[PDB]
Write a protein that binds this ligand. Structure first.
Ligand code: HEM
Length: 152
């Protein structure tokens, strides 16, 4: 649960992402894969990437970063009223991709890391607080669907 002022902060931060969705999406995925290499093993189409240079050169990885961040932005713009948008993603991630909730924690922290890295001094404490709460809400609502499905 976020206040109106907190949602305003989230959507202000998101404007930074929308100015360069592919570059932000690329860096989020690279931070996830290099910080948590077990996550790469869930992607049949990226497991061939051995070095970060290969990851950086991969146009398909940038394409997938755009898909991921486009979906997250659509969810965030609902300001918590995201049941219809979130349900298919929870279902696909539990039943088809088999992504433990821990990896959603990993990517949430990676988003925070990338925002500070690309906008140093321009991602203030209030903005970090509101973005973190928004990602917690997203993860928590996914977690409820995972529990329904019995997925660990
Ligand atoms: C911000 C969180 C994330 C969002 C919004 C997101 C969104 C999406 C979307 C829109 C798709 C394509 C449609 C679908 O299959 O449902 C996708 C595919 C996928 N997601 Fe996620 N995802 C997230 C986090 C993760 C994480 C943490 C992992 C693994 C560590 C992951 C693994 C995958 C895989 C394996 C695919 C299939 C890729 C393919 O082979 O083309 N996702 N995701």
């Amino acid at each position: 649960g976020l206040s109106d002022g907190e949602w305003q902060q989230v959507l202000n931060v998101w404007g930074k992402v929308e100015a360069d969705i592919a570059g932000h999406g690329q860096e989020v995925l690279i931070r996830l894969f290099t910080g948590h290499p077990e996550t790469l093993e869930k992607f049949d189409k990226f497991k061939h990437l051995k070095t970060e240079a290969e990851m950086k050169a991969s146009e398909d990885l940038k394409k997938h970063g755009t898909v991921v961040l486009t979906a997250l932005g659509g969810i965030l713009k609902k300001k918590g009223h995201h049941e219809a948008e979130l349900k298919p993603l929870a279902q696909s991630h539990a039943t088809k991709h088999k992504i433990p909730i821990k990896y959603l924690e990993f990517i949430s922290d990676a988003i925070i890391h990338v925002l500070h890295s690309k906008h140093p001094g321009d991602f203030g404490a209030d903005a970090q607080g509101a973005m973190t709460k928004a990602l917690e809400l997203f993860r928590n609502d996914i977690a409820a669907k995972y529990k329904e499905l019995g997925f660990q």
